[PDB]
């Protein structure tokens, strides 16, 4: 093709292929949901309005467990590719009440939602990361429908050829000694997924550029390893060692945490399908025929959109849709399940730390060391149901690593519940026995703008904990600076 | 074939059938070991001795889990069918203590170990469950090695057509109106196993003719099943209504207790496998039909999984049976632990001399019913041979359900004390409740040996005793 080895533009790749410009298309419908997923984008702690506000397998814990982090304003259920950006510019977790008009994110945030980042990577170098990210918001800075992830994400215009845009994919596989041009087409279909469909941090300045997007993959895809590794690669101490990596302090626990994000690649690598040479590509861009010919296709959604599970047959052909589904189900709703539990584990775990490090009562002598250890197992029990509610597939990726994580999670805030509760001399145990709901109710609706209201506030334990915010007027709505 | 209709001489079998014969004796292999299963009856409990006294990946609070059981006494790795009765009769879970020479146990415990069941139920009808396991042990009764389980119990021998000799098989399949004439040759391929690879009962006398077996499968194959259908089936009360049922009261937290036993069907059935309707001889039994019985991870190679899984390497195969059978058995440990501190939580607050809580008793019965129940869950995935392979997912969510009720017992019991037993409950639990290493019979008659551990010290000394049978001779 003549088209731009740089381009942005979706709409230039629409002439020469008609085909998987329209399949890609497709990627509009945002009206199906399935059983645990779908194209809604409901508040994903919302399991008390009916759609499209909340859905019955909401998490109604979500806010609470991300106090203190803007995943506490908001955090819903995705749409398609075509509308990254559109989605991108209505959450509330990018402040848009601020005078001086910034997001209080970094532009690291518009890394994978735009193959725009080529250019800015070009202009501004190592320094576009740590700018904020409404630095590039205004509609002379991105067109949200043209602009948004497209055919340059994954293809070289040129050729069509597979292609990363990404520099974090790439760092890794620098790092990793492994060699795109070396690379089998088969491991490429599920590499550019991988680009954005993994977990991520942001760099810590005093260990390189602000902000630059790194893959914590170095001590292994799992969450133990992802645990380990965390250990390290946060702020230097008085004397240059980094520390162990925070990405908020709980509001409630005051514990360090760690945010899990969307691991579809980490999860799925070493699942049934992905340890067998699978890649996403064989589930979510199955061949179709369409107008004369066999296509990829381009629409990337939920295989379970499709009552006879085409997607699979070509695998699977002895197999009906609806056994196929069923084998799906069959997993998520246990790990659907054990999951809400697991959560429930989780906030009694802070809420324990949180009694204890306001208790007033004689302590045990090894007051200190207790904490500390309860401290770091809230951390680590809410990094491991994090990486599985984070992931996309509800347990199906990877059955057995879902569940298996999901039960250590528990058992790390189990721990960390028995620990806080030993440092006070089992003075708080008693508070700890009832519904942990009832001690500490779930936070249904929490927004910046209703952050500004003291009162509001006041009608819950845990959002009483947060800072009102500055009376404030609204600046930005979608790419309007107002 | 001329073959008697219930032949239980294997050897008359090695005639006209000398290829499956050959291949059924290759089943007296009883030296490799797997990753985690294998041949070498160790002691399961025993993570502390070489092979093949103990082994790296054994179960350390068995013995702790089944106090005032008989499994507290022994309870093995497996060996191949050959050796069945070889092993019945070498177990100490059977009385061989005893004066009389009783076992203690029902004859029903022969059920799944020989074919010469057809031939004694002929002979005693109902009334053989409950006569005692030992009248049908010396050498004049059964032949150790020729009338183990072999040929008669999975085939018609004139035809060699397939065959259930199992009474409680045959029983839930009147019940669940199934009939074997109008089944597949496939779902045979699995029912032969499901005779014996299954969980069971005894049934109580007041219910039905004494222990005879049950399979408890009315509500569901599940371990949720499971525990539901134990809220019956128990002895009567006084309106005529069966109460929960019970195999044992633990010795420790006198919770009663569900015991269950190596569930393969019932775990594998709707597993990735058996719902795909792949059966037990598939993978058992690869291609002449081979009658080696046991692990086929001892195949390097997996050939019994490449007419299936033909582009894939046995040590692919081998890593991805791994994959869930190590995340299995890491946590079945944990949930093992958890259930002893529930236990010991129970124990703790029954005996419990401050101030209780003013709703102690409720508190105390949802404890007990929680640890009943979790411990049920850990032990339809401990008992079950595959440690989360035929199931990964079922053993796994299990595991995690057990735990969660083991903590609520603990949870229950020490608010019924106001929270007195907190401080006591906090520890490495393997402190406050030692695994129990060895415990035997005989070692229960010597009051010095059971005061050397909390819990043995719990159970009462057994009248000093010679032993009276050893094998099939008396003494
Ligand atoms: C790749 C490494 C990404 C980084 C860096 C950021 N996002 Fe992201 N985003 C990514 C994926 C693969 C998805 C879909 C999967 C999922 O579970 O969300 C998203 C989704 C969003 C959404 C929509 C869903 C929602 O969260 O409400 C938003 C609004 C969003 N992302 C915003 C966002 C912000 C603020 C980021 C910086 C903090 C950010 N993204 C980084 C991939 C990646
Ligand atoms: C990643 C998220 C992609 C997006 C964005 C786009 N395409 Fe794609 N394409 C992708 C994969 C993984 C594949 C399979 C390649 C293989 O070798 O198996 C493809 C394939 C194509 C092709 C080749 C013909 C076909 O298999 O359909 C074409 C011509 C193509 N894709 C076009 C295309 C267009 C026009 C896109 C923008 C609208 C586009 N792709 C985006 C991955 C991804
Ligand atoms: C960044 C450049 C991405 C690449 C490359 C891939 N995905 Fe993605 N995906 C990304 C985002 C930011 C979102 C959320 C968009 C929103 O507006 O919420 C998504 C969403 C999906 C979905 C859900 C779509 C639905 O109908 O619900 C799926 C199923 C999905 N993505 C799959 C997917 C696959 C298979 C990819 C590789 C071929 C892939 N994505 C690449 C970001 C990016
Ligand atoms: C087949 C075995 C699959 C492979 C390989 C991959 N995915 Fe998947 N995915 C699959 C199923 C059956 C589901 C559940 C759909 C449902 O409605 O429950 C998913 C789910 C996802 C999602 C969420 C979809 C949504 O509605 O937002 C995403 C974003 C996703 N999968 C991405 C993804 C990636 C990145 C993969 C490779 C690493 C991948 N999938 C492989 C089936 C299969
Ligand atoms: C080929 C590229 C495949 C596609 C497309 C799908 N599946 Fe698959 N599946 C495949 C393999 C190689 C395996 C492992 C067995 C092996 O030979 O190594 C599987 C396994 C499953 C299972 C069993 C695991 C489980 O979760 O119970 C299920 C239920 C399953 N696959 C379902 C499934 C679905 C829903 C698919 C479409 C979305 C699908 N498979 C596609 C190979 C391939
Ligand atoms: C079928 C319904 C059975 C009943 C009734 C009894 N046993 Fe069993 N036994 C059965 C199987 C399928 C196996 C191998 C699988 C396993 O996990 O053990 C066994 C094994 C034994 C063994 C050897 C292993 C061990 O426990 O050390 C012994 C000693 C044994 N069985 C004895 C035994 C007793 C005492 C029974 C009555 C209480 C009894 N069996 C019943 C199948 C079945
Ligand atoms: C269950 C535990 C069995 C034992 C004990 C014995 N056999 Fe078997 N046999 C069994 C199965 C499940 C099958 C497969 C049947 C099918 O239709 O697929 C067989 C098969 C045979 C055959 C048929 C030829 C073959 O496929 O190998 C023969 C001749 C045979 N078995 C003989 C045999 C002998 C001699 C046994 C005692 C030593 C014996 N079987 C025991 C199940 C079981
Ligand atoms: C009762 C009549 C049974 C029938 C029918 C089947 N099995 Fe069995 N099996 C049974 C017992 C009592 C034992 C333990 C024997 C001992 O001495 O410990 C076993 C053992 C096995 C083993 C383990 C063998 C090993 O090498 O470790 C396996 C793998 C096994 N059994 C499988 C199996 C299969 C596939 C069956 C159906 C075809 C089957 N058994 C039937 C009792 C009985
Ligand atoms: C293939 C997918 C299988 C099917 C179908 C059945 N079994 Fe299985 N079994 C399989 C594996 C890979 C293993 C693990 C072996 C190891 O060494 O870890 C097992 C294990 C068993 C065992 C225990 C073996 C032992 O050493 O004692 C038993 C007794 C067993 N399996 C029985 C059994 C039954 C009754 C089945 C049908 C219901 C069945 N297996 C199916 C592989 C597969
Ligand atoms: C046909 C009769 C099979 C034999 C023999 C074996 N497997 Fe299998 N396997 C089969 C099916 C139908 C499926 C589900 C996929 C589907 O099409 O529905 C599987 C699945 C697996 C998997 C993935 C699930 C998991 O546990 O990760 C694995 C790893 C697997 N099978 C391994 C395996 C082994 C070790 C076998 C020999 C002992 C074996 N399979 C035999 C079909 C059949
Ligand atoms: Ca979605
Ligand atoms: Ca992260
Ligand atoms: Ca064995
Ligand atoms: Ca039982
Ligand atoms: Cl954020
Ligand atoms: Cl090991
Ligand atoms: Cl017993
Ligand atoms: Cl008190
Ligand atoms: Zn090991
Ligand atoms: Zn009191």
Redesign the interface.
Known sequence: TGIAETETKMSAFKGQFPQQYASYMKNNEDRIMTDYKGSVPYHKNDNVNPLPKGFKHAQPYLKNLWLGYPFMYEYNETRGHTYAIDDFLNIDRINRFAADGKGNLPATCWNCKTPKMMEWVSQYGDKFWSMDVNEFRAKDKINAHDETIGCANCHDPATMELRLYSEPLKDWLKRSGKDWQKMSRNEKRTLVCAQCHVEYYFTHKDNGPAAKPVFPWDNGFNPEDMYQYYKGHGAKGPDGKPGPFVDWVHAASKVPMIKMQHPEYETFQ?G?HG??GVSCADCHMQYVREDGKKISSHWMTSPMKDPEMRACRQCHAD?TGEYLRQ?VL??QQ?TFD?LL?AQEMSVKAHEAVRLANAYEGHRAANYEALMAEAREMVRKGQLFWDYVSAENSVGFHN???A??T???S??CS?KAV?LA??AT??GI??AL?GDIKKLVPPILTLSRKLQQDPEFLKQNPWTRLLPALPKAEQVWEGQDRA
């Open positions: 070493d049934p340890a067998a197999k084998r069959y997993t246990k054990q539990k059955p057995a690593k569940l298996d999901l039960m250590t528990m058992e189990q028995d509760t030993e001399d089992f145990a008693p026995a």
